[PDB]
């Protein structure tokens, strides 16, 4: 564990997968089949936390995708004018998993920071207002809440948000 790095998945599909366990078998099985297939379809960008060795075993991963948001129905908008805005651009961090070996070691947080660094670098090339994450359960919810993510309520409950501006602030 001297030699960890975070690399984008290289499309060759040449890592060591099934010897990976984070304790939640949804994330594990998502890595087993879904991650490489969803990556090669550019439905996501996979980032691999692995050792800088020839064997290259995986200790973590996260996924980034483009996304966009909208409001349900804008009322009383005869105020001055109405230039519609239908595809408001954002990025989603879909899922994030750490091998049980690296639990209790802040690696979740450093992966989150790395994703924010990727999103901030993209910020200067395309317009991106902020970063949603999905929190499937209580532990993920509070975890993301403790980094600054604002919870959304009501049928958007399982989603939190972080503005791109406060990402720029993180890297002053």
């Amino acid at each position: 564990m001297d030699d960890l790095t975070i690399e984008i998945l290289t499309d060759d599909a040449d890592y060591d997968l099934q010897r990976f366990d984070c304790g939640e078998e949804a994330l594990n099985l998502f890595l087993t089949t879904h991650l490489v297939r969803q990556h090669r379809n550019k439905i996501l960008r996979a980032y691999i936390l692995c050792r800088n060795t020839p064997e290259r075993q995986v200790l973590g991963y996260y996924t980034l995708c483009g996304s966009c948001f909208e409001r349900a129905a804008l009322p009383s908008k005869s105020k001055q004018k109405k230039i519609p805005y239908k595809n408001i651009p954002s990025v989603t961090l879909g899922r994030l998993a750490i091998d049980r070996s690296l639990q209790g070691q802040g690696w979740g947080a450093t992966l989150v920071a790395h994703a924010m660094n990727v999103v901030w670098s993209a910020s200067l090339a395309v317009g991106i207002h902020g970063l949603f994450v999905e929190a499937l359960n209580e532990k993920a919810h509070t975890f993301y809440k403790s980094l600054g993510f604002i919870p959304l309520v009501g049928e958007n409950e399982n989603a939190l948000f972080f503005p791109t501006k406060s990402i720029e602030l993180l890297f002053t």
Binding site: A113, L147, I150, S166
Partner: protein
């Protein structure tokens, strides 16, 4: 340009044949238009987030006055540097 061989059950064939005849398309036309339009809307709906009144409010206020990065988060940011 490409090809897909679908193996179909005899009932689904008669159903799709009735519908293709109703739209006066060939079976293949019907199936490929059905797949292509459904895939487009599945992708559109997967990429979009619809925000209700209050989630929208909180996203907006976040953009207006964005929050300061908390000490935990900054502490991880300085790890990966």
């Amino acid at each position: 340009k490409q090809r897909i061989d679908l193996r179909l059950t005899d009932d689904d064939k008669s159903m799709i044949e009735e519908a293709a005849a109703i739209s006066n398309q060939s079976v293949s036309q019907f199936m490929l238009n059905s797949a292509s339009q459904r895939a487009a809307e599945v992708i559109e709906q997967h990429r979009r987030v619809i925000l209700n009144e209050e989630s929208w409010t909180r996203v907006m206020d976040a953009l207006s006055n964005p929050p300061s990065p908390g000490e935990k988060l900054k502490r991880a940011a300085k790890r990966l540097q």
